C-alpha cells in the first residue's frame, strides 16, 4: 500500500486535493532494502552474502541485495581494478546514523582491504596519497552502484579533491 502517486499530497498552494481513485498497482513502491555488510565475519559467516530477486512491472526482475561483502573498485588514474571486500562504511551525506549500522547506499564512502591492490604500490609512484592508503591496508572508496536496484556494490577509489574532502570530515573519529 506504499504508493508514489501525488493524489495523497497537497497542491502548490497547499490546498488539500480530493482523492478520485483507489490505490493502483502501477503506482506502488516496495519497502526499502537495508543492505547490511558481513562486517562481523566471526558470527556473520553463518549467512553468506545474500542477494534477493524481486519481480517488477513488466516481469523484468530487479536483483535486490540484503547482505553484501565485496565489489569491483577502480583507481581510475592508475587503471588498477580488483574485487575488494568492504571493511567498513564511513561518512554518508544522507545520515551518519546509517554509517553506524553499516547499511550500504550508493554514495557511501567505504574502506576496502588493500591486499588485492598490493601490486600497484610496488608499481612505481602511482599517484601519491592513494599509495599511502595501500601501504596501510585501508583504502577509501565511494560505492557507485545502487545496492538493492542491481544487487551489486561496485565503486571507485577516492582521489583528487573528493578524497581530501571526505578525509577532512573523518579526521577526528
Amino acid at each position: 500500500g506504499i504508493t508514489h502517486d501525488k493524489m495523497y499530497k497537497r497542491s502548490k498552494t497547499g490546498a488539500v486535493q480530493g482523492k478520485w481513485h483507489k490505490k493502483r498497482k502501477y503506482n506502488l513502491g516496495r519497502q526499502p532494502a537495508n543492505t547490511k555488510l558481513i562486517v562481523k565475519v566471526t558470527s556473520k559467516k553463518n549467512e553468506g552474502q545474500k542477494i534477493s530477486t524481486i519481480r517488477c512491472r513488466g516481469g523484468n526482475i530487479k536483483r535486490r541485495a540484503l547482505r553484501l561483502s565485496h565489489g569491483s573498485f577502480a583507481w581510475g588514474s592508475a587503471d588498477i581494478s580488483h574485487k575488494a571486500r568492504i571493511l567498513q562504511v564511513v561518512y554518508n551525506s544522507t545520515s551518519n546514523e546509517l554509517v553506524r549500522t553499516n547499511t550500504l547506499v550508493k554514495g557511501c564512502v567505504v574502506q576496502i582491504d588493500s591486499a588485492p591492490f598490493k601490486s600497484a604500490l610496488s608499481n612505481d609512484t602511482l599517484d601519491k596519497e592513494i599509495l599511502d592508503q595501500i601501504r596501510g591496508d585501508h583504502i577509501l572508496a565511494r560505492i557507485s552502484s545502487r545496492p538493492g536496484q542491481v544487487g551489486t556494490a561496485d565503486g571507485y577509489i577516492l582521489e583528487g579533491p573528493e578524497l581530501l574532502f571526505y578525509q577532512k570530515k573523518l579526521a577526528p573519529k
Binding site: 502548490k12 588514474s77 551525506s93 582521489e159 579533491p161 578524497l163 574532502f165 571526505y166
Partner: protein, 151 residues
C-alpha cells in the same frame, strides 16, 4: 567548506582530472543547448556545479519553450516566472487578461532580478512544481512599471 555534508562534482568530470596537467584536462562539461540558443560564458568559465543547470548539468531541454517575466528570485536557485496571456469570451467580445505562475530552475550561470524577461525551456519534472528551466535572460530596469506583457 565542511558544512557542505556532501561533495558536489560534475558526473562527467572524473575527479582525477584536477591533478596531472592538460592531456584530458577538460575540468568542465558544457553541452550545447539546441533550438538555436547559445551557451553562456558563465557555464564554460563557471566554477559552480548544479545538476539541474541545462548547460553544465544532467537536464535536457525539449518540449515547449515559453517566455515570461520574473515574479521573484527568493527561492534557492529557482524563480517563479509569471507569464501573462489573454482569454477571449465570445458572449462579451471583450477579453480577460489572465496571469499564471510557473516555477523555473535558475542556473547560477544566470543572475536575474524581479521583472526580467526569462526564456524558460521545458525540462524533466525536476521537482514538485519545477518542470521548466531558464534557457536565457535579458535584463530590465529597476523601475519601469509592472506593465502587463503577454509576449
Amino acid at each position: 567548506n565542511q558544512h557542505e555534508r556532501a561533495y558536489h562534482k560534475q558526473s562527467q568530470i572524473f575527479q582525477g582530472r584536477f591533478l596531472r596537467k592538460d592531456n584530458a584536462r577538460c575540468l568542465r562539461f558544457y553541452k550545447s543547448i539546441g533550438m538555436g540558443y547559445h551557451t553562456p560564458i558563465t557555464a564554460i568559465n563557471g566554477t559552480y556545479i548544479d545538476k539541474k543547470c541545462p548547460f553544465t548539468g544532467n537536464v535536457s531541454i525539449r518540449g515547449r519553450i515559453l517566455r515570461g517575466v520574473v515574479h521573484s528570485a527568493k527561492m534557492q536557485r529557482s524563480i517563479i516566472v509569471r507569464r501573462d496571456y489573454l482569454h477571449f469570451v465570445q458572449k462579451y467580445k471583450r477579453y480577460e487578461r489572465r496571469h499564471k505562475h510557473v516555477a523555473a530552475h535558475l542556473s547560477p550561470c544566470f543572475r536575474v532580478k524581479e521583472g526580467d524577461i526569462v526564456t524558460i525551456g521545458e525540462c524533466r519534472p525536476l521537482s514538485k512544481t519545477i518542470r521548466f528551466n531558464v534557457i536565457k535572460v535579458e535584463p530590465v530596469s529597476e523601475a519601469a512599471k509592472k506593465r502587463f506583457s503577454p509576449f
